[PDB]
Design a protein around this ligand. Structure first.
Ligand code: HEM
Ligand SMILES: O=N[O-]
Ligand SMILES: O=N[O-]
Length: 153
């Protein structure tokens, strides 16, 4: 559990993300791919990209970032009561895309990095700690679902 104040910290900084979902998505995916290049291999449409500029110019990458953040924002807004939203995501990520937990850790790291970089006043120790808890809970619960589906990733 997060407290209600922790949830509110999460959603307060999220509202900043919602002002420009695509640009935040671009920064987060580029951070993920630069930090953990093996992750890029999972995206057949754009796995050939090399430079930061190429990544910024890619329509497909920009769409992917919005796809992620739209889903994740809907998850966060449930304040832990997200089983229904996690169900389809676990299904595709376990059985189709095969995204291991370690990669969800990497993207969680990238999200934290970008929020700290862009919104430090809204991302002090309080809010960092609350977002860390929120993303940990997402990963815990998705991991259980993965296993239910037969995927030990
Ligand atoms: C916060 C974590 C994540 C969220 C909320 C998320 C969400 C989504 C959603 C909503 C879709 C479209 C529907 C679906 O196929 O389920 C999608 C597709 C996909 N996801 Fe994720 N995702 C996450 C993390 C990741 C990571 C870390 C990777 C790869 C390293 C990944 C790889 C893919 C792939 C390969 C697709 C298919 C389309 C594509 O190639 O771009 N996802 N994801
Ligand atoms: O690489 N996240 O889709
Ligand atoms: O709590 N989600 O499976």
């Amino acid at each position: 559990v997060l407290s209600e104040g922790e949830w509110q910290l999460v959603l307060h900084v999220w509202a900043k993300v919602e002002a420009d979902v695509a640009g935040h998505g671009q920064d987060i995916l580029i951070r993920l791919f630069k930090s953990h290049p093996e992750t890029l291999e999972k995206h057949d449409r754009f796995k050939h990209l090399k430079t930061e500029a190429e990544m910024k110019a890619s329509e497909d990458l920009k769409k992917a970032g919005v796809t992620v953040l739209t889903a994740l924002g809907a998850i966060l807004k449930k304040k832990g009561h997200h089983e229904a939203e996690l169900k389809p995501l676990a299904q595709s990520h376990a059985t189709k895309h095969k995204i291991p937990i370690k990669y969800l850790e990497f993207i969680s790291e990238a999200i934290i990095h970008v929020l700290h970089s862009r919104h430090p006043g809204d991302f002090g120790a309080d809010a960092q700690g609350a977002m860390n808890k929120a993303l940990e809970l997402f990963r815990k619960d998705i991991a259980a679902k993965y296993k239910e589906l037969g995927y030990q990733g």
